[PDB]
Design an enzyme around this catalytic site. Structure first.
Site, short mmCIF file in Angstrom:
data_model
loop_
_atom_site.label_atom_id
_atom_site.label_comp_id
_atom_site.label_asym_id
_atom_site.label_seq_id
_atom_site.Cartn_x
_atom_site.Cartn_y
_atom_site.Cartn_z
N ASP A 1 0.80 -1.31 -0.03
CA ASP A 1 0.00 -0.17 -0.01
C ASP A 1 0.89 1.24 -0.05
O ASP A 1 1.60 1.41 -0.86
CB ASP A 1 -1.07 -0.01 1.33
CG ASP A 1 -1.92 1.07 1.21
OD1 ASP A 1 -1.75 1.94 1.90
OD2 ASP A 1 -2.94 1.05 0.22
N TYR B 1 -1.56 11.30 2.63
CA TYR B 1 -2.34 11.77 1.63
C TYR B 1 -2.38 13.18 1.23
O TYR B 1 -2.83 13.51 0.13
CB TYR B 1 -3.69 11.39 1.66
CG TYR B 1 -4.15 9.93 1.70
CD1 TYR B 1 -4.58 9.27 0.72
CD2 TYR B 1 -4.14 9.27 2.95
CE1 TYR B 1 -5.08 7.99 0.69
CE2 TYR B 1 -4.55 7.89 3.20
CZ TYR B 1 -4.94 7.16 1.80
OH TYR B 1 -5.27 5.78 2.13
N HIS C 1 -7.78 -6.08 -0.80
CA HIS C 1 -6.41 -5.26 -0.45
C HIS C 1 -5.50 -5.65 0.41
O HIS C 1 -4.40 -5.22 0.59
CB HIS C 1 -7.09 -3.93 -0.05
CG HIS C 1 -6.15 -2.88 0.17
ND1 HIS C 1 -5.24 -2.26 -0.66
CD2 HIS C 1 -5.70 -2.05 1.40
CE1 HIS C 1 -4.81 -1.30 -0.16
NE2 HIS C 1 -4.78 -1.36 0.98
C1 LIG Z 1 0.02 4.20 -7.93
C2 LIG Z 1 -0.88 5.02 -7.08
C3 LIG Z 1 -2.27 5.10 -7.87
C4 LIG Z 1 -1.08 4.97 -5.93
N1 LIG Z 1 -0.45 3.77 -5.29
O1 LIG Z 1 -0.83 3.98 -4.08
C5 LIG Z 1 -1.29 5.21 -3.79
C6 LIG Z 1 -1.81 5.43 -2.67
C7 LIG Z 1 -2.94 6.15 -2.31
C8 LIG Z 1 -4.09 5.08 -2.51
N2 LIG Z 1 -4.10 4.08 -1.66
C9 LIG Z 1 -4.89 4.01 -0.71
O2 LIG Z 1 -5.73 5.06 -0.38
N3 LIG Z 1 -4.85 2.82 0.02
C10 LIG Z 1 -6.29 2.52 0.56
C11 LIG Z 1 -6.81 1.19 0.74
C12 LIG Z 1 -6.68 2.39 1.75
C13 LIG Z 1 -8.19 2.90 2.24
C14 LIG Z 1 -8.89 3.64 1.61
C15 LIG Z 1 -9.87 4.38 2.00
C16 LIG Z 1 -10.26 3.91 3.59
C17 LIG Z 1 -9.29 3.22 4.08
C18 LIG Z 1 -8.25 2.72 3.53
C19 LIG Z 1 -3.01 3.32 -1.66
C20 LIG Z 1 -1.70 4.22 -1.45
N4 LIG Z 1 -1.27 5.85 -5.06
#
Ligand SMILES: CC(C)c1noc(C2CCN(C(=O)N[C@H]3C[C@@H]3c3ccccc3)CC2)n1
Ligand SMILES: CC(C)c1noc(C2CCN(C(=O)N[C@H]3C[C@@H]3c3ccccc3)CC2)n1
Lengths: 314, 314
Positions: free
Chosen positions: A104, A235, A293
């Site tokens: 992640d 974020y 996930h």
């Molecule tokens: C390559 C780009 C698209 C990318 N890869 O990772 C990311 C980051 C941002 C997006 N990512 C991210 O938010 N991970 C989510 C599972 C976790 C989550 C989401 C909502 C509520 C609770 C938990 C993963 C890490 N961007």
């Protein structure tokens, strides 16, 4: 798994920034980096298996989490700063190199380690998170607009707002998040319109087949220490991260690398990894079926076999 | 050497007892065990040098010292209980084996590790402390009243007495102890009758050539946390240690072994070690001229040379 059966390690990387880690095993050093909103404990099934396989495992609490420092400033969690801190981490441990394995947000961190500090990275593996090179003609905010599955990320932007909801009831937060893909209760599409992330889902959610009440309660105690401000700050550095990733000037990753995709992760979709061998010549792959996930919890046995085989050869 | 530039580890070997250590390097694990009244910090010159020679150095605070637990009970510091804790320490780090290097009380601990836990000990090295098999006829109390320079050991027996003298002025204590053999300001001959250990020595002693004022102050700050009770309890288990040693009387150390002697240690005299090959025929040796009790501090360059050469060969 039992924390009090583990070695606990602490390294100060900046006067008031201290990273906590758990350590098990002898052999080459393997650094495990969890994601959002997780813990060293998310690696509980890998730690003994990797140690038994002849590796020295260091499982981190990432900056902002558990027993690591959680400064309140947003800029403390931009990728450049987190990366340099992991470099300083190796220096104080006296390690010239380590294998980095991430998931992640931790997966994103390990690709950048490999991009900008390949001399300190023996080999790199990522679960779910692909390496996608910066797009000089497209901001990160314009990528979120095109794909409405990243809507929750806008809700995460305003400081305090997402914190209040995730912190309100910690047990509920983790029971709603840590679920197999078929057991999902989350509306990821309309988060800003709804006002909340959980505001359409149960008040007393059931325990997922993935987790016990004991495991959930471990995360509860951990997040009482600093809450969600630190973790969510990950974020809030999109433009800063974008501008930093541009400085790579399309260089390649030339070290041994592993991309493991998970069939049922609906945010870090497997197809998102498809062009990676262009930028990463020596890339090997794994793929796990029926896996959402939360890879390490969902399919611990499959994760273990894939990582140990790749480690022993590369 | 800056403590904040080190990795600090903590292992709970039992409910009331955690052990602290500092860790540097990668490669085979080398555990360093200091004596009385020292600290992991007594290994400050060996830690970077052994790590650079390609070893993973674990430098302990022994039980009763610095950040390790220091229970008040005398029975918590008998060799049997100390050794079992060292084994539990290895277990929780997931290390099947370690090289053990000790000095002084730490020297005697590592010999006993070699005797009772050969399977957990890859190799064994002692600085100053010889391996003398238990004499089944005379008690340790009988040996003291047969040797005049061992008088201070009886002074150390009564709980509270040596503590109050040693903790009175901590700065004076360490400046008086940590000296070269030619700068020595203490008589070990008549301690019991003639007051205490410092009665005949200066009130404001000068700084020895071996130490800076900053090095003394580190020891001061460390000993402010538990004082000398734990450390002295090491000397208050003679009958139990002799009883325990007798159970090993027949067995033999077959693992690689190094005995290093200091020409000018007037308590741990070199000749005390002269019959060690009669129990360990393959024993390698080192000798350091113009070197007192405080070996690591006194001749660090020779200590490093001798240790690395032995480690790289056996
Ligand atoms: C390559 C780009 C698209 C990318 N890869 O990772 C990311 C980051 C941002 C997006 N990512 C991210 O938010 N991970 C989510 C599972 C976790 C989550 C989401 C909502 C509520 C609770 C938990 C993963 C890490 N961007
Ligand atoms: C086998 C016997 C001779 C043996 N080997 O080690 C021992 C132990 C007891 C004797 N030993 C001992 O007391 N070490 C002395 C340096 C410390 C000291 C003395 C006076 C004032 C301050 C500090 C060293 C460890 N006995």
């Amino acid at each position: 798994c039992n924390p009090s059966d583990m070695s606990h390690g602490y390294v100060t990387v900046k006067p008031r920034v201290r990273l906590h880690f758990v350590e098990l095993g002898s052999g080459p050093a393997v650094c495990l980096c969890h994601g959002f909103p997780e813990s060293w404990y998310s690696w509980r099934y890998q730690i003994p298996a990797l140690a038994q396989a002849g590796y020295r495992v260091l499982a981190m609490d990432m900056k902002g989490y558990g027993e690591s420092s959680a400064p309140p400033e947003i800029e403390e969690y931009c990728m450049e700063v987190l990366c340099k801190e992991m470099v300083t981490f190796l220096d104080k441990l006296g390690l010239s190199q380590a294998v980095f394995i991430g998931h992640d947000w931790g997966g994103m961190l390990v690709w950048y380690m490999a991009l900008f500090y390949p001399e300190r990275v023996r080999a790199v593996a990522s679960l779910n998170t692909p390496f996608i090179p910066a797009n000089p003609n497209m901001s990160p905010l314009e990528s979120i607009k095109a794909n409405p599955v990243f809507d929750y990320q806008l809700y995460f932007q305003e400081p305090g707002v997402a914190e209040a909801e995730l912190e309100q009831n910690l047990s509920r937060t983790f029971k709603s998040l840590f679920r197999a893909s078929d057991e999902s209760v989350l509306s990821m599409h309309k988060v800003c319109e709804a006002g909340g992330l959980f505001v359409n889902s149960p008040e007393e959610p059931s325990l997922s087949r993935m987790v016990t009440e004991e495991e959930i309660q471990f995360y509860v105690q951990q997040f009482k220490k600093s809450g969600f401000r630190g973790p969510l700050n990950w974020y809030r550095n999109m433009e800063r991260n974008w501008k930093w990733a541009c400085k790579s000037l399309g260089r390649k990753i030339l070290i041994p690398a592993l991309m493991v995709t998970a069939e049922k992760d609906f945010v870090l979709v497997p197809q998102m990894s498809q062009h990676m061998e262009d930028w990463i010549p020596h890339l090997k792959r794994g793929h796990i079926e029926d896996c959402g996930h939360w890879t390490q919890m969902d399919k611990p046995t499959e994760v273990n076999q894939i990582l140990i085989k790749w480690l022993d050869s590369d």
